[PDB]
Design a protein around this ligand. Sequence first.
Ligand SMILES: Nc1ncnc2c1ncn2[C@@H]1O[C@H](COP(=O)(O)OP(=O)(O)NP(=O)(O)O)[C@@H](O)[C@H]1O
Ligand SMILES: [Mg+2]
Length: 737
Amino acid sequence: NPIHDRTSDYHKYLKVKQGDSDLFKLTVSDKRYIWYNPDPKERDSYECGEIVSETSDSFTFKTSDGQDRQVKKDDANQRNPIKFDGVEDMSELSYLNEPAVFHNLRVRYNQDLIYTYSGLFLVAVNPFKRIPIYTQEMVDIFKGRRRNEVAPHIFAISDVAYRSMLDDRQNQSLLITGESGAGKTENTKKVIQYLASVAGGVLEQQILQANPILEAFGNAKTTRNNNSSRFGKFIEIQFNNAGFISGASIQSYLLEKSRVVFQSTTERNYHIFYQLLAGATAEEKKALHLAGPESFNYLNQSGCVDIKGVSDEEEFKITRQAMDIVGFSQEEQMSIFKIIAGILHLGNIKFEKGAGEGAVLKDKTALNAASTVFGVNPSVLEKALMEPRILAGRDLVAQHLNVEKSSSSRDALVKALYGRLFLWLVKKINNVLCSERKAYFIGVLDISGFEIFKVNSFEQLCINYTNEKLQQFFNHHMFKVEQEEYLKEKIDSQATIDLIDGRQPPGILALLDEQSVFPNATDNTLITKLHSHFSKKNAKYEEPRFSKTEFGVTHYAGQVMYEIQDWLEKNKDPLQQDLELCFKDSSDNVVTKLFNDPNIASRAFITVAAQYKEQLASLMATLETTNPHFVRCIIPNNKQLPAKLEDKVVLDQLRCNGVLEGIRITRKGFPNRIIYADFVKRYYDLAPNVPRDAEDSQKATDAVLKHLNIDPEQFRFGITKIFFRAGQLARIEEARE
Ligand SMILES: Nc1ncnc2c1ncn2[C@@H]1O[C@H](COP(=O)(O)OP(=O)(O)NP(=O)(O)O)[C@@H](O)[C@H]1O
Ligand SMILES: [Mg+2]
């Protein structure tokens, strides 16, 4: 039994290695320590200083260097006793200060223990290297085990969700959030894998197979991750009342369409582009008019056309086969690629103007190329691009567009194609796997946590808006659960949210929506409306001292400065009607769907923001009906390196993600809640007349306490556990046998 076999890899890779002793004694020491910032500017960098003396009010300690300093006991960051180094739950620490928390995390990461609980959360730090704890044998071990019976692992929380589901006859949710490259996706895939195994394969296969299809089209190499998810997702894993997988459904959000037409240096476009160009038969290429990526504008601009340790051709085979599995007819497959192909060509169109001011097409090659694969009409396309008829009152007149404008329209078309296509694939897949008549589900949410970049635009507001809601959800959740526990033993975000989504008074989005109806409004009208309503008027809002295009929002994670550029266009997400027209006629069977199906070609008249808001509310509604599970995925550094855990990088995430807050709150009450028997077995020796093994654990606990003369205000007799305030258990742990 691996859990019992100290030689098992389970032990090796999931546990702190255990020696031959239980004995409290080993850990004996006289030294006390504190965590101090050896540089008060750089406050996340801490060093451990031994307390060489104390006053009634402060402590005096020596630094690394031998530099004595002093601190107020109240400002002190007491170091937990070494026995606590490596605990599986931060809820077990007595001193619950930030440096303390990072240290426990760090001690673990140094032994390659990437999973740690913090109360309700499962903290997962990216290892940036392989750790073989996701095997089938690894799976087998988590089966039916309680949180407390096994080591922290993603499989563990997935097991608990599954049992709870079966046992409470209640739907479940796993919310996996954090920074780009933190490993949300990786964990997400593990949760599914696990469920597929405990509860499962034909459907299973298709279910599994759906992923790769989505990652090809929705994932790309960015500077933060080689396989970044450019869309958020909610996976609903469906079960029948017997606890077997009955189906699945996928909800996608915020796909980054812009990446299609543009990519930052060293980044790539979505994977599919390269896989196609790489894995397409020499005879498929021809039919498709394809060359190397270098031959395409949409792919030859970033400098990067390949990912190390990645074969696009091998990957393409893998994508194609996945589609094969799920059920895309070859016919389908073709058009998909044809679309990918068409899109490529569209990007290759060079607009020229000088004949006038309005643009023209000297070379119809790329144009012809695109139209062909799309099955649309080149002359209609051509016109639709440079000479759209536009409603100007009563009259409908063809406008002759310049290059820029012409070029931007072409781009808009590309992005609609891509977005709609993505949508369609999602639909197609749900069709296959999805259940009308399902009994229970476990939904997995894999999306970014708060985003605070150099530049923050409309998308960051959206994501950060979702994030305030999820944080408020946690908070409420924590509240109820903390109350129950306390109860079982006889012992805001609204303002931000409103600023964003308020109706009356209007919040940011309502203002944006308002501005949206006016063909001639501008970024400047928009930002001015915003400041007019909120500058010095809304406590969560900040009008910048000098920038005229930005504004600040005080979020849960702190202030975020947004820039308004293009918001009006993003909100409306315009496409010339003639292009729709053009494409609505397409002779391609997949193409006609993207444009003829309202569920695909349209919103609801509603804006992008209104749609975002609505989908977030549905999401929350669903979540509200589940028993939730929280996973905080943490990136260790910004360099994609193993064995390199940077306190500043780390601390900042724990600050933003709700981990440290959860603890600060929890710290104020009775953080340590131990089982009577558990307490006694380790401390019996501290009092006179206590056998490790006592039938009356509670009485026994009182003896030690009393023997020790602990301050009764510091502890709390629960019906089954002893509750201890912060520091208490440490002191205790610090007592003589
Ligand atoms: N447990 C893990 N073991 C090994 N590698 C991992 C693990 N978690 C993540 N990784 C590695 O880190 C990379 C990024 O993980 P990933 O799950 O894709 O991050 P993410 O949070 O989904 N990023 P993003 O989609 O861009 O927001 C992976 O491709 C692996 O290189
Ligand atoms: Mg991801």
